[model samples]
Target: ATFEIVNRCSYTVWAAASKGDAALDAGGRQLNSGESWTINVEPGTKGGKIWARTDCYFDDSGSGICKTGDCGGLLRCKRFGRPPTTLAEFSLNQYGKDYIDISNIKGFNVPMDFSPTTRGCRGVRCAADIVGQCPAKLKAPGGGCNDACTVFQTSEYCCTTGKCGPTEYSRFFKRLCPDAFSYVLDKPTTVTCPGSSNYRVTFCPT
Candidate 1:
């Protein structure tokens, strides 16, 4: 399977992906508006996540800071990116089932739509104007929302134990993008798809 990463935002975005220790798309790549990058997924891949960094400037040697979704300041991310990112997560061909989800647990930067190309499964989208409607405490440094888990880092928001419940912050995120994983216990946010399917992940998708 593969994901055609499309950047529909008016500004530039540097897309990054991580699967455990492996870095997909050579850690990351710069994509301007209307540009796209493709990532091929091998079978049995798990814990894969893809997201875009905003307002980044990198030198030829690939060392810089992104305003959001920065991955240790490396052009090629050796680690999962930082917060205030909308993530497209994939677990393909896991025991013949493919799991996919759009997670706002880290919060949201750009609107996202993750859809399968085949008809066997439905698509998922989170296109709410979260940045504009974000609460005062949930606002990020730049132009995105931040989850309370990131801001507070308490067990209540972080879900350290079983049966974690929702909070005001999670409800706000859930209300805007119902399909997004607003909290750590939000398993309903994940969707099952045919293992053979390919996908498209679009940023700033309308």
Candidate 2:
């Protein structure tokens, strides 16, 4: 299987991906505008995620800060990126299928699209301009929109008690990008493809 990370943004973005404790291809690397990086995955590679970091400044030793999607301030992250980020999640080769989604359940930073290159697989994307119209209460410091769970930290918003559903806040995001995961109970956002299929993840797709 392969993951082609494409940057369609006007500005540079640091793309990162990880599967469990190990890092996939393009582990915290810079992708200039219109650039891309491809990473190969083993047959059983599962539980991996891809995200982009913006407004970052790192030194030779790989220590710096990012305005959004910072992973412990490390360039080569072995862990997941921070919240308030647009995420492309995957569970490849699971039960003969590959599950994927562009999630904003943790909030959103950039627009993202995920698609299979093979025939018969449907493409899904969250390409809305969410940052510019983000709600005031859920807006992040530099950019991006914060999740209700991150902002309120209450059971109703976070769905911690299992008695939660979409509030007006989640509805805001859902209204913009109905294909993206807007809340914890967003079941319609998932997309499945055949195992080992080649895929493309594009950021800020035009």
Candidate 3:
């Protein structure tokens, strides 16, 4: 198996995903310009689904000047090819009430592990009971560090702050199309600082 992403938007792009299922973990994988990945799949697995997430960010040049200044739209899984008949296009901002939530990725037959390390805010209600939790929002640490602690879309604390919340990607999947194979993609529509960040998505082969 293999995977890759093309950035049509302005700025550098990032990607991430769970190793196999939501019970695993979520994180960023570096992708250079026009990069493609050759994923190793289990033998006789027939085929597998790859959940890919992408978002735009500005890489800090350290020149005392931020280069790219733009609100990169939410990274999108614009397309997924060679997928099983059960797999379908999933999105957050696309559908109205019918939209699938980002949190729902956990419930797929091949569960996705949400990334917990990334820092940023995502609009979704999150819960600790949920597996694979990203930072809900940006926050300041308790007088420990000079810089305030930053929150992320997968963290619980951030979700409580009312800024960003947990991902409902899993729930969204069940509600919109229960039997469909799915994956969650992360993209930073708005960032506080300038620099490239990693975003990812994943799925398992049942």
Candidate 4:
């Protein structure tokens, strides 16, 4: 399946995707405003994610740091992105269907929309200015917004000990982006589509 990634942001974005140990597009690569990249996904791929890292800089060997979603400071990342990230996750070709979802459990930076290019399929998106209106304790540098768990790293929000519920912060995210998963343990917004469908992900969708 073809997954087309587009950058509609006024600034630059580093498009990143990872599945298991595989780093699609060399972990990540830069996409100037209005640029797009296409990558194909193999059938039966599971637990893969695609996201964008904003305002990043890299050298000839594709190594640099980012403001929010740094994965080992490398342009080609093997690790998943750091918190405060908007995510499009997928499990493809599972039992004759494809599962897709958008999530902000890590937090948010740029607005995003993930949708299939097929008939009668539901898409998911999160297009909010969470960064600008970020709460005092949940704000990050370079305009990324953080969830309480990313900032506090505690049981109340992180749920490592398995007792966690929605906080005002997660509710805030849900209020703005109804289709996205706001935090860990939040009800899933995952949807299924036919196996033949292709997809697109747009950054700064609004």
TM-score of each: 0.96, 0.95, 0.22, 0.95
lDDT of each: 0.89, 0.87, 0.25, 0.86
| True-vs-predicted CA distance for residue 148, candidate 4, Å | 1.5
lDDT per residue, candidate 4, 10-124, as tens digits?
9898888888477865568789999998987788888888989976888887888888788878887777888788989999989899999998888898899999987768888
Off by over 4 Å in 2: none
Candidate 2 local lDDT, 3-117, one digit each (tens):
8899999999998888748788646788999998988877777788899999999999988988888888888777887878898988888989988888888899999989998
Candidate 3, superposed: residue stretches over 4 Å from native: 1-13, 17-36, 42-50, 56-172, 181-206
lDDT of 1 at 97: 83
Select the stronger candidate by TM-score from 2 and 4: 2
Q: Better model by lDDT, 1 or 4?
A: 1
Best model per lDDT: 1
lDDT of 1 by residue, 91-202 (tens): 9888878999999999999899999987688989999999999999989877689999999989899997766899999999999999999999975878899876899999
Worst 10 residues of 2 by lDDT: 19-28
* Cα TM-score of candidate 4: 0.95
Model 4's alpha-carbon lDDT is 0.86
